[PDB]
Enzyme design. Structure first.
Site, PDB file in Angstrom:
ATOM      1  N   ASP B 139       0.879  -1.051  -0.051  1.00 28.80           N
ATOM      2  CA  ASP B 139      -0.097  -0.170   0.062  1.00 28.80           C
ATOM      3  C   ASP B 139       1.455   1.425   0.224  1.00 28.80           C
ATOM      4  OD1 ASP B 139      -2.421   1.183   0.449  1.00 28.80           O
ATOM      5  OD2 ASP B 139      -2.617   1.476   2.130  1.00 28.80           O
ATOM      6  N   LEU B 142       1.270   8.265  -1.726  1.00 24.54           N
ATOM      7  CA  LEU B 142       2.013   9.379  -1.835  1.00 24.54           C
ATOM      8  C   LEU B 142       1.562   9.471  -0.167  1.00 24.54           C
ATOM      9  CD1 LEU B 142       0.596  12.077  -4.741  1.00 24.54           C
ATOM     10  CD2 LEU B 142       3.025  10.567  -3.904  1.00 24.54           C
ATOM     11  N   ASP B 157       2.825   3.608   7.391  1.00 22.87           N
ATOM     12  CA  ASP B 157       1.686   2.986   7.649  1.00 22.87           C
ATOM     13  C   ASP B 157       1.606   1.407   7.349  1.00 22.87           C
ATOM     14  OD1 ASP B 157      -1.452   2.812   7.628  1.00 22.87           O
ATOM     15  OD2 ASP B 157      -1.128   3.402   4.893  1.00 22.87           O
TER      16      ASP B 157
HETATM   17  C1  LIG Z   1      -2.581   6.930  11.310  1.00 21.49           C
HETATM   18  C2  LIG Z   1      -1.997   7.301  10.748  1.00 21.49           C
HETATM   19  O1  LIG Z   1      -0.383   6.985  11.027  1.00 21.49           O
HETATM   20  C3  LIG Z   1       0.809   7.402  11.049  1.00 21.49           C
HETATM   21  C4  LIG Z   1       1.088   9.010  10.930  1.00 21.49           C
HETATM   22  C5  LIG Z   1       2.038   9.035  10.630  1.00 21.49           C
HETATM   23  N1  LIG Z   1       3.254  10.756  10.854  1.00 21.49           N
HETATM   24  C6  LIG Z   1       3.762  10.534  11.506  1.00 21.49           C
HETATM   25  N2  LIG Z   1       3.727  11.998  11.589  1.00 21.49           N
HETATM   26  C7  LIG Z   1       2.922  12.611  10.933  1.00 21.49           C
HETATM   27  C8  LIG Z   1       2.508  14.027  10.724  1.00 21.49           C
HETATM   28  C9  LIG Z   1       1.463  14.111  10.119  1.00 21.49           C
HETATM   29  C10 LIG Z   1       0.870  13.118   9.765  1.00 21.49           C
HETATM   30  C11 LIG Z   1      -0.710  14.218   9.208  1.00 21.49           C
HETATM   31  N3  LIG Z   1      -0.837  13.101   8.088  1.00 21.49           N
HETATM   32  C12 LIG Z   1      -2.141  13.443   7.089  1.00 21.49           C
HETATM   33  C13 LIG Z   1      -2.295  13.122   5.811  1.00 21.49           C
HETATM   34  N4  LIG Z   1      -2.068  12.485   5.018  1.00 21.49           N
HETATM   35  C14 LIG Z   1      -1.840  11.605   3.957  1.00 21.49           C
HETATM   36  C15 LIG Z   1      -0.558  12.261   5.800  1.00 21.49           C
HETATM   37  C16 LIG Z   1       0.388  13.463   6.886  1.00 21.49           C
HETATM   38  C17 LIG Z   1       0.912  11.996  10.157  1.00 21.49           C
HETATM   39  C18 LIG Z   1       1.765  11.605  10.715  1.00 21.49           C
HETATM   40  S1  LIG Z   1       3.091   8.601  10.514  1.00 21.49           S
HETATM   41  C19 LIG Z   1       2.066   6.944  10.401  1.00 21.49           C
HETATM   42  C20 LIG Z   1       2.578   5.296  10.745  1.00 21.49           C
HETATM   43  N5  LIG Z   1       1.395   5.182  11.112  1.00 21.49           N
HETATM   44  O2  LIG Z   1       3.359   5.247  10.604  1.00 21.49           O
HETATM   45  C21 LIG Z   1      -1.667   7.975   9.538  1.00 21.49           C
HETATM   46  C22 LIG Z   1      -0.866   6.699   8.752  1.00 21.49           C
HETATM   47  C23 LIG Z   1      -1.120   7.025   7.226  1.00 21.49           C
HETATM   48  C24 LIG Z   1      -1.759   8.123   6.635  1.00 21.49           C
HETATM   49  C25 LIG Z   1      -2.559   8.997   7.451  1.00 21.49           C
HETATM   50  C26 LIG Z   1      -2.655   8.451   9.159  1.00 21.49           C
HETATM   51  C27 LIG Z   1      -3.067  10.170   9.642  1.00 21.49           C
HETATM   52  F1  LIG Z   1      -3.566  10.866   9.111  1.00 21.49           F
HETATM   53  F2  LIG Z   1      -3.869   9.341  10.798  1.00 21.49           F
HETATM   54  F3  LIG Z   1      -2.225  10.482  10.859  1.00 21.49           F
END
Ligand SMILES: C[C@@H](Oc1cc(-n2cnc3ccc(CN4CCN(C)CC4)cc32)sc1C(N)=O)c1ccccc1C(F)(F)F
Ligand SMILES: C[C@@H](Oc1cc(-n2cnc3ccc(CN4CCN(C)CC4)cc32)sc1C(N)=O)c1ccccc1C(F)(F)F
Ligand SMILES: [Cl-]
Lengths: 297, 288
Positions: B139, B142, B157
């Site tokens: 998956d 961007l 993710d």
């Molecule tokens: C569940 C979450 O998980 C994260 C978050 C991470 N993260 C780390 N620093 C960050 C700074 C900002 C942002 C905010 N998002 C907003 C939506 N955009 C598509 C990406 C950045 C996220 C950041 S890393 C990470 C992971 N699972 O490895 C997550 C995973 C995949 C897409 C969106 C998100 C969510 F929107 F929920 F943040």
């Protein structure tokens, strides 16, 4: 007796080419067939007349055709015509290119609630049309809930179907054994439209839970559980869905919702119903928001 | 069920203060959190245990954590630990202050070739580490290619990620729908490491062209185009870049470059790769 390579109708002189094998329904075999003139592809049901020699089987075949040919609804398999030679009876039906909910369930097991709700609403709409036309299907299962290219549900296989001659008429005789045996069919108490709601109850359970509500490893225990109404809803099932299953799966047929009340349940009216499902839903679970709104990209 | 203002770990007695909201990933919500003791700021992923009641969701959550906690690479989002109370599961991840390539792409649209090359080399380096550790992401998009202060790419993710147990294992079941559906996933034919190269192919296209290669207004036409490998590269794309996209976006998974062969393509070896990108590149095109 071998099946002809080309199927010819004595009357309309219409001729079909026997294409890909689709499967067999007990006594019948089904083939993808195409009109040699128009090139329009259909589902050909082919029954050996050798197996219809028992008059009680001729009744079943004639009754199936009589009922199916009278039906026309977007959630019922289209009936395009029937004919016979001296060896076989040929029935020409709508082709549903994505098979049935049985194949989906075998691949996906437990569906998401929105998917379950999407499929179940169409199943209920189809059954509502049947019941309004005084028809009881009496054998609704995943295997005869067919899916077209757009994953629209089509009810087929009227092999056990009966027509109600007056409003509150109750029936005894079945020419076969339904997949989901309602308690009033098991007890030979007489039955009406309520058997269809029971089976829709079993189907809803299977789609959300990923296994049948009563079916065990042996039929003796299966039928004892149905008689005593012994089944367990997992705590992970949502309260509104759990409630609707409990309404449909009741021993007392008069206690169950009618097909009209079923459609107007909170599960359908207050639950998220997708307009379409993507074709990937056949093999992998789709993404849905916790709170879907029609005010979103 | 309300989310706690302060997040406490039963083991280690570590305590984090729930800061600014970052966004939600379907079922999960993400917050900027800071260790009350050290003052070190992290990305806190918070999942309601109410939505994990279905065992097949607990498998997905446990598998994501199991895979992510075993990874350590400068192009993979750091995993600093996990814990739970009776209501929620808490996952502590590296904070990537400049969000992801999705936000960049929405603002800039089509990048310059050197920018594309800069980002894609780091994406490939990260994926090379995953594949060498027998991990398929399945998956890459961007939205989960995160950017830190210095605009270094971090792959996060691992919600759909699987670990390969033996040589030549092909996988069928996915617990969700990838953004870039490889033709072997659409056809349910079985898949391996090659799906990651496909998605990197779709990502490279989007960065240089400014829109996805297959995505149309309706998903039915989108999936038919993927099945038949129907896509068009604009004539304005450079021949070496156009060539590499064609290699990665092939129906036959065995025909695509491996992640090792991908890195050794003329696009990377013969193309100008900036050492750094200035912070202005988030909003305006840089000069080289
Ligand atoms: C569940 C979450 O998980 C994260 C978050 C991470 N993260 C780390 N620093 C960050 C700074 C900002 C942002 C905010 N998002 C907003 C939506 N955009 C598509 C990406 C950045 C996220 C950041 S890393 C990470 C992971 N699972 O490895 C997550 C995973 C995949 C897409 C969106 C998100 C969510 F929107 F929920 F943040
Ligand atoms: C006799 C046959 O009758 C049909 C067939 C129909 N049909 C229309 N388009 C289709 C596309 C594919 C498949 C293939 N089958 C394979 C077995 N599976 C359980 C269901 C789909 C069947 C399709 S509709 C219909 C009907 N009676 O209304 C039938 C009835 C009930 C269960 C099975 C079959 C049989 F396996 F034989 F197909
Ligand atoms: Cl059952």
């Amino acid at each position: 007796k071998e099946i002809p390579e080309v199927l010819v109708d004595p009357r309309s002189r219409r001729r079909y080419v026997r294409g890909r094998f689709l499967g067999k329904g007990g006594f019948a075999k089904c083939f993808e067939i195409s009109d040699a003139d128009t090139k329009e592809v259909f589902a050909g049901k082919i029954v050996p007349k050798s197996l219809l020699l028992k008059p009680h089987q001729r009744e079943k075949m004639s009754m199936e055709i009589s009922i199916h040919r009278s039906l026309a609804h977007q959630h019922v398999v289209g009936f395009h015509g029937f004919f016979e030679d001296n060896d076989f009876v040929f029935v020409v039906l709508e082709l549903c290119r994505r098979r049935s909910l049985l194949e989906l369930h075998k691949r996906r097991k437990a569906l998401t609630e929105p998917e379950a709700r999407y499929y179940l609403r169409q199943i209920v709409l189809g059954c509502q049309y049947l019941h309004r036309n005084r028809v009881i299907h009496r054998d609704l299962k995943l295997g005869n809930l067919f899916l077209n290219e757009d994953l629209e549900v089509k009810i087929g296989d009227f092999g056990l179907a009966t027509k109600v001659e007056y409003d509150g008429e109750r029936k005894k005789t079945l020419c076969g054994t339904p997949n989901y045996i309602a308690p009033e069919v098991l007890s030979d108490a007489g039955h009406s439209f309520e058997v269809d709601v029971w089976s829709i109850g079993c189907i809803m359970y299977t789609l959300l839970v990923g296994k049948p509500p009563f079916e065990t490893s042996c039929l003796k225990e299966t039928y004892l559980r149905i008689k005593k109404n012994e089944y367990s809803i997992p705590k992970h099932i949502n309260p509104v869905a759990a409630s609707l299953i409990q309404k449909m799966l009741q021993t007392d047929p008069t206690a169950r919702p009618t097909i009209n009340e079923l459609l107007n349940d909170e599960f359908f009216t207050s639950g998220y119903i997708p307009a379409r499902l993507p074709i990937t839903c056949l093999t992998i679970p789709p993404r849905f928001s916790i709170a879907p709104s029609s005010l979103d990209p």
